[PDB]
Design a protein around this ligand. Structure first.
Ligand code: MG
Ligand code: MG
Ligand code: MG
Ligand code: MG
Ligand code: MG
Lengths: 199, 38, 129, 143, 93
RNA sequence: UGCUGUUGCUGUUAAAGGGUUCGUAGUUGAACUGUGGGCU
RNA sequence: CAUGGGAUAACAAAGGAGCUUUUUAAAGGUUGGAGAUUAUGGAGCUGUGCGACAAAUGCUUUCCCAUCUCGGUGUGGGGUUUA
């Protein structure tokens, strides 16, 4: 069937129940939507994973795609994200590129040859940018409490508080499931002068 | 002698690059055909 | 020019404590400086502190309770075997009942009391009491 | 200009922003930006001047934030980099004009003093560029 | 000076010829686009070159230095009295 | 005898900063690739 | 001299445009032992086709040559895609 072409060739054999449902939606949109019809033909996904966020009603759909299409996805991410939501009520979709990490070497000579975009610091930062893409990070702080813990907080612009407020609980939980790191969010009106906004 | 050896290596590398690109371009022409053969 | 980031940071903290300030700002930051602060924080000599990111060498804002008397760096970073601990305690510490010497060892950064228990030597970084 | 060779202590400079994403209203593709950079180079502009033309009249605040690479990197890939680095070129030009002035005004001792400082700056800079192989070995500055 | 900047562009991108005899040959043909003469030129030789430019309607520039300066401004290590640029590349003039 | 001072001296007026710059050996030299996670 | 540890450092190098993998098929270029002669094949060498899977950066590319209202979402209203 033609819609299976939207998957990686490995998974065209026995797709999972989530994979082909997304594949049908992508195939149908590639011929109907006005702006998606010239980017989608070159696009195909790797896998789709389901995450259940505790203490919540909505569930999260995570879609993995090859890093080749990073610029392709960024161009149509807004339309693609909203379009998939309608086909899948009661769910939230995030598009994440699949990246690999080289473990930190112990020898000095090897450390000089590491490709910097494959370090865990760089990779985890880009994963976070994928989950909030229309918005961007305007500040970042680390809080070191007396008990010895260290908590990281990320500040977003207050101009787009209305759009992304509902999704922050889901984003924080999924980010922990992929990186095993804790994150917290806040908003800044006038980030130039570092003014945080309370409600 | 050293310069001649280096030049030979350069020529071999360029030939391999061109051959790989040609094979890649020939591939996916079949995939394009299958898209028109649905 | 500025040759030692650690020496610059510790002198800033000691000066603020002597004048009785409640907070102090530190720049530039470093991973060695952060490790040193956590050692002091664990024994209760400083309060909460916070790291601010600016795509460069960052900055630190630390809250001070009134418990710190002095902190300082040792330059150059002399080597210290396990048998030299009594020598350094005798020279730069007020008493044998309180105060610490901080070392960098192959096991990490730690105070002299913990290093002795682990039976390891290293290089002297500084002190606080 | 400020600290090396003198007593100046000025601080004037630019401050790059924390947010490195180009604005929404900028609708120029990366390919076209690269074309304009190479076009201005053939016209005869130096990398410093190229970046100011785009900043002043094209809305491009930082070329790196749009294309991913710096201006001099773009020229090197297209075979348009200058023979010697730009800052070394301007220092040599200044010393040449000082020497031409001094061959008529032989008693301008203030200018003679400034010529010593500029030539010391040239020799320090040449030593750095030879170590990182941006200059041929045995490159020499001739008075 | 503005003239020196353009000469460097021509010297690296365009085509040119150095010397009075070769410059006159380009003027007898139609390939010459601009002729530059140093101020240290023999008066009878200058008058002959200017006459050729008037007949062929070629723009002519009077350089402000001598034949030593003109040679240095072209990156050469010898003196040139007359310069003729047959091809101008990426330059206004 | 902390009156040879690495630990540990002094240099405004008690003895002692070179008239001012440039500069080679030498000594000294900014940040960054790193919070493992889940169970009772 | 041997060996365990890698936090702080030192030496050396570089100056960043000197920068795919796999599967089939075809083409050529030990004989009783010891001493000579030859041939059939491995393996690797190139150049043809074939199957399968990746790719850290889009070949249903770029380039100029031309020729002619509904749905999902949060609290009856808001914001998103679309019409
Ligand atoms: Mg004594
Ligand atoms: Mg004395
Ligand atoms: Mg005196
Ligand atoms: Mg004096
Ligand atoms: Mg350092």
């Amino acid at each position: 069937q033609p819609h299976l072409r939207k998957l990686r060739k490995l998974k065209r054999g026995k797709p999972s129940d989530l994979e082909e449902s997304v594949a049908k939606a992508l195939f149908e949109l590639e011929a109907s939507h006005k702006t998606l019809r010239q980017e989608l033909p070159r696009f195909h996904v790797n896998t789709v994973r389901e995450v259940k966020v505790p203490r919540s009603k909505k569930t999260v759909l995570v879609v993995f795609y090859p890093l080749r299409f990073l610029m392709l996805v960024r161009k149509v991410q807004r339309a693609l994200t909203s379009e998939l939501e309608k086909r899948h009520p009661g769910c939230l979709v995030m598009l994440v590129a699949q990246r690999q990490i080289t473990k930190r070497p112990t020898d000095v000579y090897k450390l000089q040859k590491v490709q910097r975009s494959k370090t865990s610091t760089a990779v985890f930062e880009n994963i976070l940018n994928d989950m909030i893409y229309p918005s961007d990070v305007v500040g970042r702080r680390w809080r070191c409490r007396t008990d010895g813990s260290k908590l990281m907080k990320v500040f977003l612009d207050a101009r787009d508080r209305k759009r992304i407020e509902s999704r922050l609980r889901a984003v924080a939980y999924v980010y922990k499931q992929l990186t095993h790191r804790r994150v917290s969010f806040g908003f800044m009106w006038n980030p130039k002068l570092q003014q945080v906004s309370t409600r | 002698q050293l310069a001649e050896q280096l030049a030979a290596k350069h020529l071999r590398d360029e030939q391999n690059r061109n051959k790989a690109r040609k094979q890649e371009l020939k591939k996916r022409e079949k995939e394009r055909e299958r898209a028109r053969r649905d | 020019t500025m040759m030692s980031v650690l020496a610059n940071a510790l002198r800033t903290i000691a000066s603020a404590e002597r004048r009785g300030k409640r907070q102090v700002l530190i720049r530039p930051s470093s991973k060695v400086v952060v490790k040193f602060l956590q050692v002091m924080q664990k024994h209760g000599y400083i309060g909460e502190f916070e790291i601010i990111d600016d795509h460069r060498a960052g900055k630190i804002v630390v809250n001070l309770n009134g418990r710190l008397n002095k902190c300082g760096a040792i330059c150059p970073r002399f080597d210290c075997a396990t048998t030299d601990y009594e020598k350094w305690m005798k020279n730069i510490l007020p008493s044998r009942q309180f105060g610490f010497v901080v070392l960098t060892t192959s096991l990490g950064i730690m105070d002299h009391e913990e290093a002795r228990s682990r039976n390891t030597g290293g290089k002297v970084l500084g002190f606080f009491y | 200009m400020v600290r090396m060779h003198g007593n100046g202590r000025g601080k004037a400079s630019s401050a790059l922003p924390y947010r490195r994403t180009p604005p929404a209203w900028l609708k120029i593709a990366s390919r076209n930006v690269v074309k304009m950079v190479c076009k201005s180079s053939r016209k005869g502009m130096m990398p410093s001047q190229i970046g100011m033309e785009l900043r002043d009249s094209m809305g491009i605040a930082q070329v790196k934030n749009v294309t991913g690479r710096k201006i001099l990197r773009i020229l090197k890939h297209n075979g348009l980099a200058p023979e010697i680095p730009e800052d070394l070129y301007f220092l040599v030009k200044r010393a040449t004009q000082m020497r031409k002035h001094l061959e008529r005004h032989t008693t301008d001792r203030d200018t003679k003093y400034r010529l010593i400082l500029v030539e010391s700056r040239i020799h320090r800079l040449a030593r750095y560029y030879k170590r990182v192989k941006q200059l041929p070995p045995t490159w020499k500055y001739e008075s | 000076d503005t003239i020196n900047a353009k000469l460097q562009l021509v010297m690296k991108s365009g085509k040119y010829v150095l010397g009075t005899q070769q410059a006159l040959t380009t003027l007898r043909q139609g390939r010459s686009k601009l002729v530059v003469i140093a101020n240290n030129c023999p008066p009878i030789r200058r008058a002959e070159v200017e006459y050729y430019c008037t007949l062929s309607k070629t723009p002519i520039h009077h350089y402000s230095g001598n034949n030593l300066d003109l040679g240095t401004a072209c990156g050469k290590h010898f003196r040139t009295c007359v310069l003729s640029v047959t091809n101008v590349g990426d330059s206004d003039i």
